[PDB]
Amino acid sequence: LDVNFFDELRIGLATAEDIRQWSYGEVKKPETINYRTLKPEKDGLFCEKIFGPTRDWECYCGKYKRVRFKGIICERCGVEVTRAKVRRERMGHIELAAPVTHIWYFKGVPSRLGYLLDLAPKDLEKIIYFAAYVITSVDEEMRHNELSTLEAEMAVERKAVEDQRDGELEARAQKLEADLAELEAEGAKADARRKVRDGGEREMRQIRDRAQRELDRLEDIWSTFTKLAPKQLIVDENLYRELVDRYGEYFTGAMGAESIQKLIENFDIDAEAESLRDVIRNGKGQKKLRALKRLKVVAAFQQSGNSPMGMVLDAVPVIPPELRPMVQLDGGRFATSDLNDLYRRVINRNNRLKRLIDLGAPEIIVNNEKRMLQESVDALFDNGRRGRPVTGPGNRPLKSLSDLLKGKQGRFRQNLLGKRVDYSGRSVIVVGPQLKLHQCGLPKLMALELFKPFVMKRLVDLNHAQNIKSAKRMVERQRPQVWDVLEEVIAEHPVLLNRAPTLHRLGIQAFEPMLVEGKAIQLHPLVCEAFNADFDGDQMAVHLPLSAEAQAEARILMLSSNNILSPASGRPLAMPRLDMVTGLYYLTTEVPGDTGEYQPASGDHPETGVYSSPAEAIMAADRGVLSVRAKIKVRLTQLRPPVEIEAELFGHSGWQPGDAWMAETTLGRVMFNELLPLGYPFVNKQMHKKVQAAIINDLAERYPMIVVAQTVDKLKDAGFYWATRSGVTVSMADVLVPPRKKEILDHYEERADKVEKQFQRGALNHDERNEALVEIWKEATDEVGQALREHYPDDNPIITIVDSGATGNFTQTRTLAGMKGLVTNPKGEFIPRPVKSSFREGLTVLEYFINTHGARKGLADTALRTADSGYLTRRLVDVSQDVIVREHDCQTERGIVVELAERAPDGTLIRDPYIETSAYARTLGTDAVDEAGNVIVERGQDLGDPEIDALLAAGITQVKVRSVLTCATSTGVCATCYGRSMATGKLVDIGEAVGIVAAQSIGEPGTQLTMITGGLPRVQELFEARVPRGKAPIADVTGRVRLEDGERFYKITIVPDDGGEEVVYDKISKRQRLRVFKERVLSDGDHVEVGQQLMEGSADPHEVLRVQGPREVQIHLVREVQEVYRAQGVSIHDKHIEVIVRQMLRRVTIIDSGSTEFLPGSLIDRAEFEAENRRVVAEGGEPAAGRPVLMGITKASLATDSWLSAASFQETTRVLTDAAINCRSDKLNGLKENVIIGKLIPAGTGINRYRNIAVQPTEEARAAA
Amino acid sequence: VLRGSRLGAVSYETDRNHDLAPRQIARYRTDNGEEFEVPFADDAEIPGTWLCRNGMEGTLIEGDLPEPKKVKPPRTHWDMLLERRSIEELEELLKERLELIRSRRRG
DNA sequence: GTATTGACTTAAAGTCTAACCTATAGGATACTTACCAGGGACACGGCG
RNA sequence: AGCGAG
DNA sequence: CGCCGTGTCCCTCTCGCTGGCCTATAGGTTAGACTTTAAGTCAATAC
Ligand SMILES: [Mg+2]
Ligand SMILES: [Zn+2]
Ligand SMILES: [Zn+2]
């Protein structure tokens, strides 16, 4: 109905009564349509009488028609006359002739049916598929009382079989007497008599073996009866039949799904649950473990009022026909839905079962039919789960009813969270440098097609068209007059531009579209790095916001000129790069001895280098007098001087717009400083990439973002102009080889030859020689690189591009000129040849072949890595959906300590290297104290660059800041604890989805992390909390490390200072080398602390958590992830990893239930844990002890309270099976659930405080108007 | 595009809830004591038997009760036997079987 | 222009008759069992 | 299936 | 009652383009024309 009356979405088992209450009929015949008239057939799968009419408002024959007969049913055909779209809504149901079991609750490991009934999965599969009988009832009373009468009968029968046995023995004796009489009365061979006698005694041995067979056949059956109890499986139906004919009463046995039905019927959940609870409480061991797992399914059917019966089906619901359409494709060729085949099979087998039971058939045929019906329902619900999948034409599996939901191509992920949209286009992008940062060229044809609903209206209003259809005709023929109207419609109507993949937020940005001539979207050069879009065919898509809210969001939140800083680290993303950096570096660089320079020589003439104003400087530049890169002194009267000269000449209130000063700089630096705002002081620095980035950072921090956008645009223009004028170009004469190359190659080939000799004399093995040669040639490559670096002039276009920060590193320059160096084996090792030639010299054939290995390996690795990083990003987004800013402040005292500078041994504070990503953009939780003095900066400060400067000046290192980890608010986090928003540059808003931003910021730099595990796999196993490969154990208690030296192992024993119970470590492998504890490596009998890693590598986060509480595992995780990301050279603020880590540590393991519905081993949320403790302290206190646990991103995501998000995340079938068993209601509170149900997400502009803002004119405005 | 169709069609006709044809809800009762309402139009005799949502036919619950008759059980093994054998030989075989069993029990 | 009657022809049923589909049955020598990944996590049976 | 961008 | 081995299940990036046997009976359905009837049409006329 309405997305506001959508408070909850409950899932549970659908009993047969519910299934036949949904149904509007029963599909009784396995038919779809008529072959000739091509109309729905009666009682068929597409029956019009059940699911409604194929045409709006008609009965099947035609008697009743049109809306005037709405809600009626024709008495001839029985079709209800209503809208045909109800065929997408009404369901049917097949009434199975015999019960079947839902496959989801049988095959899905763990078998929930088995756990409920305590039947082994093999036994359940035997019973359900008619391979073994099972006993469902036993009259213990009549068993007990007749245990003597039937004992008497069995004694009689045993006596009779023994009597025939002894009669057979006597017959043997008589025949043996005859045989011996024959043997010893007539003349025979000495052995022939013994041959026949042994033959006869062997016949009697066989007779006694038959007697033993009978004794077994009777006594085994009696024993089987004596222990006959319910839920006992009976293979070898011969024994079963003998039992039924003999002790048929005293026990009831069945076979198949109906037997499980009877078992569940005769199954009191309360008593079983109570017995299981007693067993888990009193017993222990593996028995208790199996008991506990069974109580996760036996409790679910108790806590809720759900029957355990929904597992066994008596009716199968039939999906509405239009969800499985039968369409007449062009050419008449009909196209089934692949589900009508499975339904047809089910109905055929059900009807055949009905007929077989009606006729009266031997149990073999009817049981085979029942097994087939069970298999058909299984295939309908899940193909290929048991046995070979049911295949259709072409030998392909039939798309079952569950395959529609699972996978990347399933329904939850291909049609609900991601959809195709109207009002969208795609085209190749071409750079437009004449655009402004908030503009994008939009091809005329694409814009006209996108906006044609609007253009039709406008050219009807202008009277260029008479009505809407005429206007549409003009648009379809692109009449010459519909282009100006287009320009009038497109005005200030933002369009979102997207480039797949959207690795982060700034991959969708709203631009004010401008019309361009042909077929290409003109993108601004600056937003390229935001999109990661270069112009070699990088198509991108354009979406058109329609509603007022959509336009407002595109214009305010997403405008490209509003998104300059990266949300990950806050560094500018729209700053100039490549050509513009080269242009600005060329413009602002100074070259001594240039034309027009400044010379102070006297005695013959004045300095003859000084200029009265920048206008005169540019006039001189026009003449061949003054270069733009020549040191001069100029009189400046419109650009503010730097802090030192300002404080000297002005001191206090230097008002620069009018005052004049002397600037000893180049003209290019003056021209550049004219691009920056008026308030910005003179820079007077060569503009490397780093310097430009720092300038833009400072500008964004101090000035409004509009000023930032305009300054950035002017910088782009100047950079392009002076990159054109820079004359950077490449030629084989601009690539200089080092002149000492041959001497170096000879000097190192001598060492290589010495190593080869040494190998030839057996001095060292193959591996050692390979390593030595690798080292030699590595040193050689280093030396030739140094020679090349020192040989190059500082003016060369190659080195100028590399060393101006524009692009490229010096390794590429060395590869181009000099020595490419060693090359990687296809396996991964280093080939020791090596490639001893440059790319300017040209590689030989074999050198090129050796080179190709690593390049192909890298191109395959890049694909696999982008896949892995995308998967990790998906997991990180899904885990932290529910972390969004809710409040402004917790007022929580708890905080995290950050070290900042480190005290020098001689005494000095050196700034910590990784401080920009740790302490910046954080809020102080506790006031800073310097030498027990006053406060340098108190709590509740953004802790920006001036703050850090002041702290380092004071002489204080550790400071307590507020972080999401120690955030007291329960739902999401708060603005203050989260801190400053890196993108916006100020305190975060009260609706920001910081979880999504954190996930995207962590997962975008992946695909640039060049994978102990040390790259993307390391981050993957850190977030997943998996035990690492290099499980390096850490100490448990402060003590002395009694170390040994073992063979194939070690023992890092430790004798504590608690003196308690010294623990030893296991077969710690010899390959793992010892760690460097503080300078001295771990020495035998050395005092270690509580956490000092003993062996090299990583320590599994779980152990460090168990040993040091949650805070130290938090620090360990953040430090390890940040170390992995720094090792490659990527900067991510610590707060994003902190958000993810916070999401990982939110649950507690239950050790003691207490007396409140808490299973041992259950992972329960800490907030709910505390709430239950508060509820239980009163009315009798039974504290349920618990212990912190570190989950992973996948486990933490799939444990959410919403089944709609967990199901759409991963393992849809398991999630839905468990949710159905538990009767879980989804409150529809996260972002994924709201997206799925198509209602406003509770973040950003959708929260309840911003959405229902009341807007009205101010009273004075109304009075004026 | 392959451009398929579900057959049937669409009909934009301004939905009316005001002037609607008169209806007479008719109750039917199945075998398993389940009532079922059916909105038939007044200008048509209410049928005496409806295949209800239950999946089994139900008669009208008012009086009437026409109670028709249908063909007896389509066929039967005995009937098929009587189309290839007569009574006298079947009786003779029954006597042979009876005497055989009597000899088995008492001789 | 707007009030009528008297013919004068016409499509739409409404119905009876005929053929062409449709549900169904049957067939008697004898034949008797069909057909290339890994990587991680969890659960079940053996052995000590 | 081949193919493009990352 | 632990430790091990084996079997099974789920996962593995986004977007985009092109085109490749026979017979016999009984019963229901429709098509086709005949006859009737509501329906559309024309001519003259009076106020
Ligand atoms: Mg590209
Ligand atoms: Zn009808
Ligand atoms: Zn907080």
Q: Following DSSP, what letter does each residue of A221-275 receive, concatenated?
A: HHHHHHT--SS-EE-SHHHHHHHHHHS-TT-EEE-SHHHHHHHHHT--HHHHHHH
Check CB contact under 8 Å for A68 and B16: yes
Contacts of A448-455 spanning 24+ positions with Cβ under 8 A: A448/A475, A448/A478, A448/A482, A448/A483, A448/A486, A449/A425, A450/A423, A450/A424, A450/A425, A450/A495, A450/A542, A450/A544, A451/A486, A451/A489, A451/A490, A451/A493, A451/A544, A454/A489, A455/A482, A455/A485, A455/A486, A455/A489
Cβ atoms of A523 and A442 within 8 Å: the answer is no
Is A75 in Cβ contact with B40 (below 8 Å)? yes
How distant is C1' of E46 from CA of A811, in Å?
114
* Cβ-proximal residues to A97 (8 Å cutoff; 6+ apart), any chain: A350, A351, A353, A354, A357, A373
Question: What CA–CA distance (Å, rounded) separates A1244 from B31?
Answer: 59
Query: Looking at strand D, which nucleotides approach a protein CB closer than 7 A?
Result: 4-6
The tokens describing A824, both together, are 């990687």
A343 φ/ψ angles, rounded to the nearest 5 degrees: -65, -40
SS3 A490: coil
Q: What is the CA radius of gyration of chain B?
A: 29
CB atoms within 10 A of CB A932: 5
Strands (E) located in A988-1047: 1039-1043
Q: Which residues of A touch B6 (CB under 8 A)?
A: 54, 322, 325-327
Beta-carbon contacts of residue A1083 (< 8 Å; ≥ 6 apart): A1041, A1043
Contacts of A488 (CB under 8 A, 6+ apart): A458
Quote the Cα angle for A783-A786-A790, to 5°.
Answer: 145
CA gap A123, A132 in Å, rounded: 8
Across the interface, which of B3, B16, B44 has its CB nearest the CB of A330? B3
Q: How far is CA A285 from CA A282, A1150, A1153, A1161, B69, in A?
A: 11, 17, 18, 14, 70
Identify the CA nearest to A636 among candidates A683, A599, A594.
Answer: A683
Beta bridge partners of A40: A33
CA-based Rg of chain A, rounded to a whole angstrom? 42
B-chain CB neighbours of A23 within 8 Å are: 53, 55
**Which residue in chain A is spatially nearest to B25 when comparing CA positions?**
A72
The dihedral sign for the CA sequence A1021, A1027, A1031, A1033? positive
Q: Dig out the tokens for A719 from the structure.
A: 């950079």
User: What span, in angstroms and rounded, lies between the C-alpha atoms of A982 and A962?
Assistant: 16
Contact A684, A669 (CB under 8 A): yes
Provide CB contacts within 8 A for A160, sequence distance 6+: none
To 5 degrees, how large is the angle CA A426–CA A431–CA A435? 100
Helices and strands (H and E) in chain A: how many: 45, 35
Distance CA A150, CA A158 (A): 12
Other beta carbons within 10 angstroms of residue A565's beta carbon come to 24
Which chain residues have CB less than 5 Å from ligand 1, an ion? A 534, 536, 538
Q: How far is B22 from chain A (nearest CA, A)?
A: 9
Question: Shortest CA distance to A589 belongs to which of A849, A399, A311, A799?
Answer: A799
Of B13, B23, B53, the CB nearest to A71: B23
* Strand blocks (E) in A390-463: 424-431, 439-443
Residue B14 CA distance to nucleotide E30 C1' (Å): 36
The resolution of the experimental structure, rounded to one decimal in Å, is: 3.1
Please enumerate residues of A whose Cβ is less than 8 A from a Cβ of B.
20, 23-26, 28, 38-39, 49, 53-57, 64, 66-73, 75, 78, 84, 93, 95, 322, 325-330, 335
Nearest CA among A356, A358, A397 for reference residue A373: A356
Of A24, A66, A72, the CB nearest to B13: A66
CB-to-strand D contacts below 7 angstroms: A 500-501, 532, 534, 536-539, 863, 866, 870, 1007
- Nearest-neighbour CA in chain B from A13: distance (Å): 21
Element (DSSP H or E) covering residue A137: strand A133-137
Site of tokens 């073999």: A364
Q: How many helices (H) and strands (E) does chain B have?
A: 2, 4
- CA–CA separation, A1171 and A861 (whole Å): 49
Tokens 């009532």 sit on residue: B35
A393 touches strand E (CB under 7 A): no
- Determine the length of chain A: 1265
How far is Cα A288 from Cα A280, in angstroms, rounded to an integer?
5
How far, in Å, CA of A245 to CA of A253, rounded? 12
d(CA A443, CA A469): 25
- Chain B residues close to A53, C-beta within 8 Å: 8
Q: How far is C-alpha A1085 from the geometric centre of its chain's CA atoms?
A: 46
User: Which chain C positions have some atom within 7 A of a protein CB?
Assistant: 22, 25-26, 28, 40-45
Written as six digits, the tokens of A88 are: 């997408």
Count CA within 13 A, CB hemisphere, residue A921: 26
Six-digit token pair at A29? 């015949």
A61 in a labelled binding site: yes
Q: Are A1042 and A1053 spatial neighbours (Cβ–Cβ below 8 Å)?
A: yes
Tell me how far apart the alpha carbons of residues A894 and A925 are, in angstroms, rounded to a whole number.
Answer: 7
Q: CA nearest A133: which of A213, A231, A49?
A: A231
**Residue A538, nucleotide of least CA–C1' distance:** D5
Binary contact (B5, A71; C-beta < 8 A):
no
Statement: the CB of A865 is under 7 Å from strand E:
no
Question: Which residues are CB-contacts of A576 (< 8 A; sequence separation ≥ 6)?
Answer: A526, A584, A692, A712, A715, A716, A719
Backbone angles phi and psi of A516, in degrees to 5: -125, 165
For ligand 3, the distance from its centroid to the CA atom of residue A1193, given in whole angstroms, is: 22
* Candidates B4, B20, B47; nearest CB to A327: B4
* CB count in 10 Å sphere of residue A912: 17
| Cα–Cα dist B92/A850, whole Å | 100
Q: For residue B60, what are the β-bridge partners?
A: B28
A1223 assigned ligand-binding residue: no
Ligand nearest to the CA of A972: 3
- Which nucleotide is closest to the Cα of A36 by its C1'? C21
Q: Distance between CA atoms of A145 and A917, rounded to whole angstroms? A: 82
Helix, strand, coil share (%) of chain B residues, nearest 5: 25, 20, 55
Element (H, E) at A295: helix A286-298
> Which DSSP symbol is given to A1026?
P
Q: Virtual CA dihedral for A739, A745, A750, A752, nearest 10 degrees? A: 160
Q: Which residue has the tokens 């009697």?
A: A204
Question: Length of chain B in residues, anyone?
Answer: 107
Residues ≥6 apart with Cβ < 8 Å to A967: A890, A892, A973, A974, A977, A978, A1142
- Chain-centre distance of CA A139, in angstroms? 56
Helix (H) or strand (E) holding A509: strand A508-516
Distance of CA A1138 to the CA centre of its chain: 17
**How many whole angstroms separate alpha carbon A1189 and alpha carbon A1144?**
9
Is the bond preceding A110 in cis, omega lying within 30 degrees of 0? Answer: yes
CB A1022 within 8 A of CB A1121: yes
Whole-angstrom distance, CA of residue A1205 vs CA of residue A878: 8
How far is residue A106's CA from residue A108's CA, in Å, rounded to a whole number?
Answer: 6
CB < 7 A to strand E: residues 411-440, chain A: 418, 420, 426
Cα(A1043)–Cα(A1084) distance, integer angstroms: 5
- How far is residue A431's CA from residue A526's CA, in Å, rounded to a whole number? 10
Residues 34-63 of A with CB under 7 A from strand E: 37
Question: Residue A486's closest CA among A478, A497, A495?
Answer: A478
Give the 3-state secondary structure of residue A823: strand
DSSP A135: E
User: Is A538 annotated as belonging to a binding site?
Assistant: yes
Identify the three-state secondary structure at position A922.
coil
Contact A107, A386 (CB under 8 A): yes
- Asked whether the beta carbons of residue A25 and residue B55 sit closer than 8 angstroms, the reply is yes
Q: Which of B7, B16, B55 sits opposite A54 (nearest CB)?
A: B7
CA torsion, points A584, A590, A593, A597, in degrees to nearest 10? Answer: 90
Please name the residues in contact with A132: beta carbons below 8 A apart, sequence gap of 6 or more: A123, A126, A233, A234, A235, A237, A255
**In the PDB record, what is the listed experimental method?**
cryo-EM
Is any Cβ of chain A less than 8 angstroms from the Cβ of B51? yes
Question: Which among A501, A494, A370 is positioned nearest to A423, based on CA atoms?
Answer: A494
